[model samples]
Target: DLGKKLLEAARAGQDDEVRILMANGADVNATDNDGYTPLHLAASNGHLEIVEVLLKNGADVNASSLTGITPLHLAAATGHLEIVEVLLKHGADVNAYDNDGHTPLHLAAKYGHLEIVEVLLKHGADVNAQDKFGKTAFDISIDNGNEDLAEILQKLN
Candidate 1:
């Protein structure tokens, strides 16, 4: 399928081929069966180059998949600081919530990706942003036993 092919191209980081496909009229915003775009695959896999290429070609940074997970959400959830930074620099919404209402900050803290959490916070992430469970980033960190992140969150306030 075109979506699978596009996702594969993105995962392989085939910048030249990706460009050619786009030039040949492949939907730059095409989503996979899971509603994940090429940009989503690139970001989730930490392919910074592919992410940049897609963004330059007009991929939506804040585009959500079937699960409402954006590229920024994937980047932060996986601790891909550079990827997260690139997305942020390209205008990814820092406060975008996923299906469960968890923002990127919530994911970062939940996963103990301190660097990502720090970067997000520096980029104006709302530490107090509430999720579906009515939990804040700090609350999520503490619930996950991430004392370090909890402490950092405490300091931020």
Candidate 2:
């Protein structure tokens, strides 16, 4: 149960709890029903330190939830720039799409997270990829009235 327990601790931002569980040999890559790993929970909640710990413990940086939402997607969607950076440095796919064909760049642009968008792009996120609706991150940025971010998207082409 250390796996499930570690997930709970990570979700709650209890870094010390996570450390204890990890020391107790928790499965760093454990998943729940949704296929969400300890890394996914840590990334989604913006727990940078916890993410660091999990990554060092051999957690998959690109682990996806049941919906194909990777830790990179959640981190970008929530505008967790630091987590995004960490995930990218660990080889998380910048262009990984979700069930709807939306990549982390799309989420970052849709939410008007300019810095996140820039970071994702800087890390080689594809700007021209369309989602299920045939919308690119560029289009989403423009639709969201984020010309600044849209311009960043444009430069990627």
Candidate 3:
């Protein structure tokens, strides 16, 4: 229940509520029915302060969802640039993949988040990592018609 409140607080971007829940001994890494944690919701929704509180309270930056989607993946996929940076700073796995084998880099590339893509690569994300379909982030960038992103990835592939 405490964790659910924390999750809701995070999803709602209620920074104070998140901290209150954390201070009340809520599980920072607790997961919901879909395996989404407070970090996942906060990071995906672009709540930087909530994410920071969760991390400061010891949330697992690499905690995977039901589909193996980590908080970093959500942040990157949603183009939450600052959240992505914070997660990485807190040691989120740059190479973590989902059940579909898509890494944060892949999502960033797929969404044409060039800056996020650059940040991922800078964190040593596997530029050559291929998904279940054997497609790399570079390939996804091509498929998504992101010429600039593709061009940037060209140097990596």
Which candidate has the highest lDDT of all? 3
62-110 per-residue lDDT for model 2 (tens digits) = 8888899999999999989999999999999999998999999999998
Expressed as tens digits, the lDDT of each residue in 7-126 for candidate 3 is 899999999888888889999888899999999999888999888888888898899988999999999999999999999998888999899999999999999999999899889999
Residue-level lDDT tens digits of model 1 in 1-117: 455676789978887878778777777789877888999888888888889888888898889988899999999988889999999999999999988999999999999999999
Query: Which of the two candidates, 1 or 2, achieves a greater TM-score against the reference?
Result: 2
Score candidate 3 by lDDT: 0.92
lDDT of each: 0.89, 0.90, 0.92
For each candidate in turn, the TM-score is 0.93, 0.93, 0.97
Ranking by lDDT: 3, 2, 1
Residue 5, candidate 1: Cα error in Å is 1.7
TM-score of structure candidate 3: 0.97
RMSD (Cα, Å) of candidate 1?
Answer: 1.5
lDDT of 3 at 115: 94
Q: Regarding lDDT, does 2 or 3 come out ahead?
A: 3
